[PDB]
Structures are given as C-alpha cells and as structure tokens.
Design a protein around this nucleic acid. Structure first.
Lengths: 98, 200, 52, 53, 203, 148
RNA sequence: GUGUAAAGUUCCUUCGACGAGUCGAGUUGUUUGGGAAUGCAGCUCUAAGUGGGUGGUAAAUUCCAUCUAAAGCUAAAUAUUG
RNA sequence: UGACCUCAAAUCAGGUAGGACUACCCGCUGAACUUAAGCAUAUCAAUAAGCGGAGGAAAAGAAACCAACAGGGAUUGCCUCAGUAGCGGCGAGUGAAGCGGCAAAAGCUCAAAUUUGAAAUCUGGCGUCUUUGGCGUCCGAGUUGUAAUUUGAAGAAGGUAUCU
C-alpha cells in the first residue's frame, strides 16, 4: 500500500487503509487574502523604503547580485530571508523601469 | 576511599537532601480520602456515570505499536459519523478531542462502533421523566462497561506458503536499497543529463 | 529521623504459606494447648458450629 | 432618537413594521473604522479629514 | 477598519514617516516625567490587541526605563569570592526592561491592576513603554463579564510575580523540549527532581 | 536488629574494633573516588580496567524505543503457542494447516536460531529473523512471514 | 414563561481579516543534560504571508512531517516545620 | 462669547493601596564553608542569607506540543524511563525528556469585520421600589470605537430541506 509491509527499508511500516482527511483550517495560516494584499500595497505607498532596502536596490541596479545577497544576509540575518528580500527588490525595480 | 573489588557507586547525596525527603506516610489516608471523594462525586450525579466515554487509540512508537489503549476524545469525524455535534456530545458523557485526526480506517471504524455501542445504551431523561424511572437506573462504570480490548493476535491453523526468497534476504535487500537510495539516485540522474546533453 | 524504615515487605505467596500453616495448626490439640487455650473440654478439633 | 423610538413603538403597536413610518435617514457618516470601510467599498462621495489628529 | 492600516504601518519603523514621528515623540516623552499618565494610547491598535478598551477604568501610563545591563552593585568591584564570580561589568538582568517598566508603574499606581504593556519608543539612554492598567474597584470593570477575572485577589500584582506576557516570557513558560527546565516553574521542577521520594514499602 | 550487631559485642573494648594505631579517622584517602589516578590507581587498574577515557561516538538525544527488539530463540518459540492446544498442534500439523506464531504480539522483535525445533511445520510472524533461524524453520517445513 | 426568539443540525457557492523593535540573526553574560551554543537578558541588525516555528551536529540545495508564536481566562488530581 | 486638546487645584463625591504571619507558592538577587585528598574551571548550588508578590492552595494549562509510530493529543502528580542519553580539569562529580501504567479530568475568551435603516453600550447624580439589585430621568464616558456577531476545533455572507 503506502507502507512496505516490513520492518526495514524505504517506506517501512505496517500497511493500513488510508482514510481521506479534510485539512485543518489552521493550516491555511500563511495564505494571503485580498484584504491584506490591498492594505499592504497602500502602506507601501505611504511608508516608502527602509535605508537598507534603498541600498540593496542600488547594488541590484549595479549588477551586484552577489553583493546584494551578502548585504541582505548581513541585515536580515539568515540566508533564506535574504533570498526573499533580494527578490522583492528585483520586482520593485522591475515595476519602476516603465 | 576506593578499596576491594566492589562496584563503583553513583549515590547523588552531596546536596542538602535531608531537607527535601518526602516520606509517604499518608498513602493509606490518601487512598481512603480518595475513595471518599470518589463516592461523593458519584453520589452527586447519579445515575449519570462518573466517567466520560473514551475512544481507543494506538500507542505511539515502534515499541508500543502492538498495544492499544484508551484515548482522550473522539475526533470530530468520528462524531460526524454517528451524527453527534461535539458541543452536544460533551453534555452526554462522550469526550471530544479536536486535535486527533484519522489517517487510517481501522481506528476510525473501531471508535465509530464504540460510539454506536454507547449510543444504543444511552437513555436521555427530560422534564417528563419522573422520579421512578430515574430511580430504576443504576450508576454503571463506563470504562468497565465499554473496556478497551486488545485485538486478538493471530493464532490457529493456516496454510503454509513458502516464497522463493527468504525473509532474511528480503530484509537484507531492503536495508541495502535504503542505504544506497540517495547515491544511486544521484548517479542515475547525473548519468541521465550526461547522456541527454552530449547526445543532443 | 522519620525516613527510617517502618513497614516491611513480605512476599505474597510466603504470607499465604504462613496463613495456611497457621490454619492447619489450629486443628492440632497439642498446639492449641501449648498456645494456652482452655480446650480440654472441647471433644474434637476443629470446632464447627451450626450456622444459626 | 427618543422621539423616533416612540413613533416606531406606536407604529409596531398598531401593526406596522416600524420601517414604513420612518423615512430612510440621510446623515453624515463618521467614525474612523466606519469611514475607512466606506472608502474601501467605494460608497463614500466626499471625505473630510481633520488636520490635527 | 483603520486598525489594519495602523498595524501594517507600525511595522515600517524605518520609513521616513515613522522615523520622523519617533524622533518627535521621543523628544516629547523625554521632556515629561519618568512616569506620567497618558490621556490615550499612542498606539490605539496595539492597545486593542493587548486587551485595552475605551471604557472608564482602563488607564494608560507612559514610563521611561534606562537601557543597558546590570552592573553588580558591589563596593569598588570587590566580590570576595572565587574568580568565576569576579565579574562586575557585562552582567545582565534576568528580567526584560518591559517587566521593569510594568513593575515600577504598578508600584506607582498601587490601586490598579497591570493588564499589559507595549513598546512605544527608544533612544540610546531610554526605552519608552506604555502600560495598560485596570481599576478593579470601578464598577464598569466589576460588572464586565470579560474582565471580572482581574478582580480576584490571585491577580494582586501579577506583574511582580511574572504573570504578565513579558514576565511569562522571562520565566521560560513555554511548551516543548526547549523548555524542559522551566515548563512548570524552574524552582518547582528543580525541587521535584531533587526530592527523595520514600514510600511505606520501600522499593 | 541492633542487638545482633557487633557494636553490642565491642562494648568494653577500647577501640570498637578499629585498632589502636590506625585510629579510625574521618576520611583518610579522600572522599568518594578521590585520587583514582594518583593514590588509588593501584585499585582502579586492578579491579576496574577501562575506567578512564573516552570510547566511541556520542549520540545526542538517544531514544531507547527505537532500539527495542527483544529476542526469542527457536527452542522457546513453541511456548508462544497456546498451552492447551500445543499437544494437539504438535501432532496434526501439516503444510495444509500449521499453527501461526505471532512473536510481535507477545512482545518480541527478532527470532534467533538457538536450539532445535519439533519436526512440525509452523508459520512464524516476526519483525526480524536471523539467517540461521529462518533456515531452521524452513527445514521443518515452515515459513517466516515478515510483519511490521 | 413576550421563545413569530435563540441555538443546533444537511448541502452549495463565494470568502475566510488570525497579535512587530516581534520572530529571526550576530555578539556578550549567565544558565542548562542541551553538546558549532537549552533558556533568559543586554546591545546591534531586523522580516514575511503558504508565511512562520520545531524536527537535539554547523552550512547550502530539495523535500517531508507537525503545529500556528509575538493577547487572555480556567476547577480536580499536587505542596504544606504557619 | 464659545467648543476642543493637554496640564492643574480642591478638607470637592465616592473608592482603593500600604502593614502583619511564614510551613507550602511565584519571581528577582546571590555566596562561601565543603568535595576535588593541593587548587583556579567544576562542586556545594541555579542552594543559604537579602528583596518583591500571593492563595487556600499557588503555579501551569487547552499545543508555533511530542513524535517518526498502524502515530499520540491542555496542564499537574505518582510509578517507570534512569543513575540512563548526555554534560564534566571527560577528573571529582552530575544528569533530564519522549514513550508506557495510573490519579484527576473541562473547557474556552479577545484583537483583527460597516450597527451604519439610526452607540443598539457603560460609570455617576437625582427619584423610586420589593435593595449583593430593578425601573425612570439627567449629565457624563465613548466614534482616536462602547454593545450584538466570530476565534482557526473554525467561521462569515448569501441559498437551502425540514427537523430538533
């Protein structure tokens, strides 16, 4: 079935008849909504950009993706959050070239 | 300080342990008063049973997979199957657990049958119910009336079917496959791009 | 100190051994007399009386 | 509001719905949450914002 | 509602607008007393999140707390002990400045119950907090089924016992394997683990 | 009982059995395992070899439930058969109908192959078997069924 | 009893707001069984929206499982040289 | 001449806090003797003394949990795990948790939603009654948000078949 039926190897365990589960509503926590997107775009218009966000955009403008990634990781702290930050800055530039 | 052929001991008594010695002289008194509390609680709510009905669940881990024990509450799906709202179910002696889900069908079916057995014996009083009818009932023990029972282990006689490959060989092959799955996948993949890029 | 050992564990089967041995001894007249009972005017042991 | 409530009590006593006796109000919408919701639903026609909040 | 906009804007603390507002408000708060009464929350949305309601009996106090660590208050730095205990500088207080702010405000307004607190501003020397307090003798609190709980005497100076959010954070009251020593109180767990439990029939 | 101890017999004799020269003192030699490498080395070397040092790799957060696998040998495998049907099973068993022994339901992890079996087909259910144990089972006409 | 009330129960569609100087990161100190760092605290940096946390060896790449933090209340089983 | 905001005063109307006790409880702060046959890390000990805060219990508590299973399911305690994984001049020492058996079992509340065809909410004064309060009325609070509705286990707005 979904288990190998023996006590060792890949996908080990006892076979059972899987029952379909309706996903919990709490699992939808990270989902975005129309309300939060609309509000977040308005606040971005009002707030502007942080000093480090402005500096990042210039590095991306100067073809310094490797430079921009290191600054973002120094600022934000982790590599995963830096990768997302550098991207939304690339989208910001892409939406200001027109 | 170290003499003769003796085991080396770990006696953790270098703190002020004599200030934290708890002697259970009150074990018998606690037993008696626990029984008195139990009696008072039972007599307050009679003939309604003192225990809520509990489900039956599989014990977690590889060591306790075999055993089956009493759970905390019937899942919302199990109560859905017997048509009892959880808010209502809490009021008629059926325990509810919003946290548990049913990935399998065996536990779900066992708990559904348990709920049906309970619901069959349930008699719900009302305003029209009089003192004589209520008096004709006895306070049962729900846990003993619906005990958690281990499924019967396999016994008896069966036909013998001998596969060609031994069980030991099967286990050895499963171990080897699991051990080298990643390296074989990496090798096969890189060979795939090697033979799909230079053959373009 | 109060954490001196006060109670003693006895194996349950050994305790039952002793109970059975004492019950058996209750039917020996020499043992009942040695124990100190005035059983010289009881005809036989054990002494069994009707359920009334 | 008390006078309108008395009139609507008389109307509901005589068996009308208390909606058919009083005309629909046309008033100034105030309150920050209420007015923001009105703006987001494109229902407001004019907004006046204080300069000293 | 505007609370969503307020909540999202307060997260842009390095924007020009919020930087300007923080400059102005930091100066203004630094001019007033260390503890003073605020007529209204300077962050109404944040106050709503923490349980504040615009009712009579809810009070807001702004307080100013000094930043940095805790120098060991020994005369001339002499500790009279073993060299592992000779440290005087680079020592840290085990409660956050948020807890200190709540405790001092609760001491000043002794007839109120500290409900919660939040961060409002910051400079080099001070952190600024706003503390939400409740009057338990006001009838609008005593007749409110959603806040009657704080009238019970077990909540006397809950901030002095670490029962506020900041205090429970500093006590390590959380679930899981990362909080094994402090799930049910550090000292209670220690006492449980350092107790010799002897029964009548010793095993 | 204090009355059977030698303290009651040492009454009247000066040193209480501790000697006049040695003079029973507080802690000559140190407390606990003091000096295990200096003046108690001659004891630790003689009676507890291997005491000092590290061997092997650490195992952070070792959960012993993973390593649960109680053994049962083949000479004891027929005890898991129901006692009252053992004699009947031992006589009529054949490849068409052999007793089934679920070792897992009795709390065993691995079947090992020590001993000899009755010359009777059996169907053994185990999580694990050794190589020799399964050879012996098939030699009497049985089989091993792997379960999980 | 003001029950043309409230509450629940089936299915469909569209939605479904969910807590920021916080999470997280570095460093310092203390603490822990927690060991390339268990918690706590100071300082500096400082988020996101299927995002975030955890999965006891640091890092990158790819998955999986499991919860939903930064707001709050709650008896009993437990302690008790007053 | 008036509102508003902020800040005051009053022997203003009515309230509230402090202090005592110490066995248990919640925090902070914090040693050294001692052990290591010396001693500095360590140990004693996250203890004593010191400070702050309670109750009849307190705390914790309805998962940003444990797991890796065929999965369990708030918190607490016991038995066990276990003198174990681990930590440690890897020396002296120290040292938990998951599972399992049991005792007791109980679950929930806000913020974030436009009532918008009507601030529907609340303190106080005054009057009255049958007074742990009810009713009426007048100021006041409150739109920088008091009620009703929802809390992720969901739920909302429409539509739906009737039932309970």
């Amino acid at each position: 079935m979904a288990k190998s039926g023996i006590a060792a190897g890949v996908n080990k365990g006892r076979k059972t008849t899987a029952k379909e589960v309706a996903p919990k509503i709490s699992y939808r926590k990270g989902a975005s909504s129309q309300r939060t997107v609309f509000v977040r775009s308005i606040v971005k218009e009002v707030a502007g950009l942080a000093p480090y966000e402005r500096r990042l955009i210039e590095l991306i403008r100067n073809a310094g993706e490797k430079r921009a990634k290191k600054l973002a990781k120094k600022r934000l702290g982790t590599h995963k959050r830096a990768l997302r930050k550098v991207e939304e800055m690339t989208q910001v530039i892409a939406e200001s070239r027109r | 300080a170290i003499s003769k052929n003796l085991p080396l001991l770990n006696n953790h008594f270098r703190k002020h342990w004599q200030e934290r010695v708890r002697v259970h002289f009150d074990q018998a008194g606690k037993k008696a008063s626990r029984r008195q509390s139990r009696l008072r609680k039972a007599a307050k709510i009679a003939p309604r049973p003192i225990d809520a009905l509990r489900p039956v669940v599989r014990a977690p881990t590889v060591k306790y997979n075999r055993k089956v024990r009493a759970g905390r509450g019937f899942t919302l799906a199990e109560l859905k199957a017997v048509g009892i709202a959880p808010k209502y179910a809490r009021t008629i002696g059926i325990s509810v657990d919003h946290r548990r889900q049913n990935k399998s069908q065996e536990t779900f079916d066992a708990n559904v049958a348990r709920l049906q057995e309970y619901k069959s014996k349930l008699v719900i009083f009302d305003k029209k119910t009089k003192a004589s009818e209520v008096a004709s009932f006895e306070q049962v023990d729900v846990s003993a009336t619906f005990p958690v029972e281990q499924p019967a282990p396999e016994s008896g006689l069966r036909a013998v079917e001998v596969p060609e490959q031994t069980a030991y060989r099967t286990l050895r092959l499963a171990r080897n496959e699991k051990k080298y799955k990643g390296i074989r996948e990496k090798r096969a993949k890189e060979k795939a791009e090697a033979e799909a890029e230079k053959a373009k | 100190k109060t954490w001196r050992r006060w109670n003693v564990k006895v194996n349950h089967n050994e305790k039952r051994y002793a109970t059975a041995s004492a019950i058996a001894a209750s039917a020996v007249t020499s043992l009942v007399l040695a124990r100190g009972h005035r059983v010289e005017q009881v005809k036989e042991l054990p002494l069994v009386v009707s359920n009334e | 509001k008390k006078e309108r409530l008395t009139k609507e009590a008389a109307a509901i006593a005589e068996g009308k719905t208390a909606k058919d006796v009083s005309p629909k109000p046309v008033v100034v919408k105030y309150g920050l949450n209420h007015v923001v919701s009105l703006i987001e639903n494109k229902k407001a026609k004019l907004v006046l914002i204080a300069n000293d909040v | 509602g505007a609370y969503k906009y307020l909540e999202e804007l307060q997260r842009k603390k390095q924007s020009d607008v919020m930087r300007f507002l923080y400059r102005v408000r930091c100066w203004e708060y630094r001019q007033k007393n260390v503890i003073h009464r605020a007529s209204r929350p300077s962050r109404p949305d944040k106050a709503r999140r923490l349980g504040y309601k615009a009712k009579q009996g809810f009070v807001i106090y702004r307080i100013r707390v000094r930043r940095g660590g805790r120098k060991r208050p020994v005369p001339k730095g002499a500790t009279y002990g073993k060299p592992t205990n000779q440290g005087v500088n680079q020592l840290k207080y085990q409660k956050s400045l948020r807890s200190t702010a709540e405790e001092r405000v609760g001491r000043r307004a002794s007839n109120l119950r500290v409900l919660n607190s939040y961060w409002v501003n910051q400079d080099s020397t001070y952190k600024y907090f706003e503390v939400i307090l409740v009057d338990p003798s006001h009838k609008a609190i005593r007749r409110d089924a959603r806040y009657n709980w704080i009238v019970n005497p077990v909540h006397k100076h809950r901030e002095a016992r670490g029962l506020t959010s900041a205090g429970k954070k500093s006590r390590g009251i959380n679930k899981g394997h990362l909080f094994n020593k402090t799930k049910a109180g550090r000292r209670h767990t220690w006492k449980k683990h350092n107790t010799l439990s002897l029964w009548r029939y010793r095993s | 009982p204090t009355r059977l101890t030698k303290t009651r017999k040492h009454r009247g004799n000066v040193s209480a059995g501790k000697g006049r020269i040695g003079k029973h003192r507080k802690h000559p030699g140190g407390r606990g395992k003091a000096g295990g490498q200096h003046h108690h080395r001659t004891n630790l070397d003689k009676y507890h070899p291997g005491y000092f040092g590290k061997v092997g790799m650490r195992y952070f957060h070792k959960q012993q439930n993973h390593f649960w696998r109680p053994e049962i040998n083949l000479d004891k495998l027929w005890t898991l058969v129901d006692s009252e049907k053992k004699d009947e099973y031992l006589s009529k068993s054949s490849a068409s109908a052999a007793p089934v022994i679920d070792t897992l339901a009795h709390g065993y992890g691995k079947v090992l192959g020590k001993g000899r079996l009755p010359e009777v087909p059996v169907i053994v259910k185990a999580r694990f078997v050794s190589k020799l144990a399964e050879e012996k089972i098939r030699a009497v006409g049985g089989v091993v069924e792997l379960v999980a």
